Design a binder for this molecule. Structure first.
Ligand SMILES: O=c1ccn([C@@H]2O[C@H](COP(=O)(O)OP(=O)(O)O[C@H]3O[C@H](CO)[C@@H](O)[C@H](O)[C@H]3O)[C@@H](O)[C@H]2O)c(=O)[nH]1
Ligand SMILES: O=c1ccn([C@@H]2O[C@H](COP(=O)(O)OP(=O)(O)O[C@H]3O[C@H](CO)[C@@H](O)[C@H](O)[C@H]3O)[C@@H](O)[C@H]2O)c(=O)[nH]1
Lengths: 435, 439
């Protein structure tokens, strides 16, 4: 017999994928896994990825909740309201779960269910240790009035200061619901058996140690998460390119920028001379609402770059593309999942964080030597950054010998961690044993 | 929970694989899938593919119908005869199918079964939109008094006129069953929820609009279909790995054999003349692998010896989609069956078109419009006239040297890539059908 565990992401591709990856890592290491999904999904992509995952992993079981009656936050509240639907589902499981992994946002709401069933519950953090360090200190931080206006930096104990320019404004307003969501779930970490984070110690040593010293001693640096597998099968344009010559661009699972800004970047691509594969979601937040068809970049750019660039509109297999030998650079939005994959695959990064914790994730990218970053660009829409400025960075990414060498080291280190003797691997095996 | 759907192909690799591809496509996308096959299969390959497919996809399920005791056509007739055998099978099935996809030929014969079962039914059309418009217009066309052979062209409504030389004589002749098959099924096209075609709008914008106008507004352009999972043998791989990129010509004249030995020899001589490196997949053919006793009594020893350095000839079946995908492949000499054209368009391989039978000549007309391939219309149906080595050799040289073609094929590939994107019509249409297909 082998232990049964369930994994439960609330919303977003950024949350969902790591959990699907965690579930596959658990299945590979000897556990029976159930993935719990809340329906209907806000986007086609999470729903499509869930269907795709189940076909790829027949052994993993699908548990679904139908939800009773800005969008991702609303979905988080929908799950919190409908969290009681999990109770009949957990009791029904053929072999009971010895563990469940639930998303950080629903830990408070799920706290009673964990108590009634006496079920050990852990959590997988999808953001950086440094941003998570700030999240844990937020309640103590909000006790003092010192972050309201005259604050250049916030000092989280045991790590160097976080400048206030990299902290999302909603996090610093007590009235805002975002603070309430973080403040409740942070208290809810006390009942967890462990808190899994998708980072490793040598990538973030001060931050991992800062969490342990600041009230999170069950933190487990389990990163990087392994790739979801796929049946082997655009390879051809990529296949036809010389190694290290192609720059991959993604601004996330959602659109980041204004058309004028994107066009400013695009001109920059041309000036740089990089061959590129670019994945564009100019649909803002939802797959379903995105109906634009390269109306964002204009026809002339496609005509001019037709030989040396491919623009994929919508979803792409980003991790799999990153793996390809042709790729030589990544222009990332600095979401922790993408940043970690760049670290894993040793791809040099030009960091362009637009919203949320991505500015702090960019700080980590710069600190480890994984990529180049300009703090002055700021949050999306604050400033217009011109072709000439962007191009200079693109040209640097190409030419920085040191960066390429440092990136290789990040990759070596990332590899060591998922090896048998590795800390991340040791820690997961240690947890599975705890059964 | 998942919708349970079934895919039913009747006969021939050209039909079977596309259904197998659709079935796999449905499975990745949240469907519980069964494949219905008729036994005994006409060819070994058909049998080989089915058995292999199930091993590759354990989750997909096999439903077999045992059959009471030209061949491919005969087999289809047999299937229509044994069509009742389904009724126990559909009844047997748990969970019940949300929808079923059945091949174009037996649409009428399955019509009763669909109605009784109150089961929504679909077709996958394995031919081009351009040929299909001709098939949907055929019933009206026969009604037209002037017999088709006398007229130089036939005008389908809203379509570029189709030249009669491009239309198989069997289609224009009333006595022939083939006419009875096309006309019957077309009429059964009204009971279906949708008709799915392995093409996309860019590839054929006029033909798809015409189908919508001409009484098939439930057509869905679902192309190109996705590639099936593979065995990945490390045996037919080595010569291809050795060669430089884009320097190898791949030749395949179909699932089945196409041409006379004299004709094949004409082409084989031409091939030496071009100077292309090549991979030729050869089949004696007629219709059946089982009956193909002869091996390289078609080409002779001398040719093989001379070209040994730069050529490989494979006799029998090969995994063509995998080969075309290879870095080494630089051109495709094709019979222009639709499944093959799409793979070339989808994979961006330049085509010299040589269609010998059936809708293949119409398909070649599409390859030409698209800029995917080079075609000579004058060559005619297979066996009509011998085409000389020099004439073939000239076309082969052009394939090598045409820079512009290279540009267009690349453009064709991009267009294919787009249809496979998440927001693309082919994906949207398919996802929508699966969503709507709940109950
Ligand atoms: O076209 C795409 C785009 C993304 N991905 C996958 O999506 C993940 C990327 O997610 P991430 O890099 O984390 O970005 P987001 O999902 O946009 O970010 C959300 O989650 C991040 C990690 O928590 C946070 O840092 C952000 O604030 C939050 O908005 C990667 O693993 C990719 O493989 C694709 O597969 N294809
Ligand atoms: O060695 C081989 C030979 C064929 N194939 C595959 O088999 C299929 C063949 O399809 P197609 O190119 O359309 O050939 P046919 O099966 O001969 O096509 C028949 O069916 C088509 C669709 O109705 C018609 O357009 C044609 O005229 C008719 O001959 C494709 O998947 C090929 O890649 C292989 O994988 N390996």
């Amino acid at each position: 017999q082998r232990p049964h565990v369930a994994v439960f992401p609330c919303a977003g591709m950024g949350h969902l994928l790591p959990y699907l990856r965690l579930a596959a890592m658990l299945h590979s290491r000897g556990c029976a896994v159930s993935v719990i999904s809340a329906h209907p999904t806000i986007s086609d992509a999470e729903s499509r990825s869930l269907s795709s995952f189940f076909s790829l992993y027949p052994q993993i079981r699908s548990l679904e909740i139908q939800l009773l009656p800005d969008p991702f936050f609303i979905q988080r509240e929908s799950i919190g309201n409908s969290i009681h639907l999990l109770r009949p589902l957990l009791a029904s499981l053929s072999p009971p779960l010895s563990a469940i992994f639930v998303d950080f946002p629903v830990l408070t709401e799920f706290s009673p269910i964990a108590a009634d069933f006496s079920l050990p519950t852990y959590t997988l953090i999808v953001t950086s240790a440094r941003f998570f360090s700030l999240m844990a200190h937020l309640p103590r931080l909000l006790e003092q009035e010192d972050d309201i206006s005259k604050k250049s930096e916030v000092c989280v104990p045991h790590l160097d200061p976080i400048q206030v320019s990299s902290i999302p404004p909603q996090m610093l307003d007590r009235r805002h619901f975002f603070v309430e969501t973080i403040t409740s779930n942070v208290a809810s970490l006390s009942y967890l058996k462990g808190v899994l984070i998708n980072t490793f110690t040598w990538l973030e040593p001060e931050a991992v140690e800062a969490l342990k010293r600041n009230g999170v001693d069950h933190i487990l640096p389990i990163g990087p998460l392994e790739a979801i597998k796929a049946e082997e099968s655009d390879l051809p344009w990529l296949e036809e390119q010389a190694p290290k010559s192609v720059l991959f661009i993604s601004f996330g699972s959602r659109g980041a920028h204004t058309k004028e800004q994107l066009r400013e970047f695009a001109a920059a691509l041309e000036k740089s001379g990089w061959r590129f594969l670019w994945v564009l979601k100019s649909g803002k937040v939802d797959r379903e609402d995105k109906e634009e068809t390269e109306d964002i970049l204009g026809s002339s750019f496609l005509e001019r770059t037709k030989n040396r660039g491919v623009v994929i509109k919508g979803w792409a297999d980003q991790e799999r593309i990153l793996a390809h030998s042709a790729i030589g650079g990544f222009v990332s939005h600095c979401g922790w999942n993408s940043v970690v994959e760049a670290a894993k695959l040793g791809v040099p990064v030009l960091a362009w964080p637009p919203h949320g914790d991505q500015r702090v994730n960019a700080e980590v990218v710069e600190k480890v030597g994984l990529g180049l970053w300009v703090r002055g660009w700021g949050w999306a829409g604050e400033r217009l950054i011109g072709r000439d400025e962007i191009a200079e960075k693109l040209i640097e990414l190409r030419n920085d010998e040191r960066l390429r060498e440092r990136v290789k080291e990040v990759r070596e280190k990332a590899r060591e961690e998922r090896e048998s003797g590795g800390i991340s691997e040791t820690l997961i095996r240690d947890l599975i044993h705890s059964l």
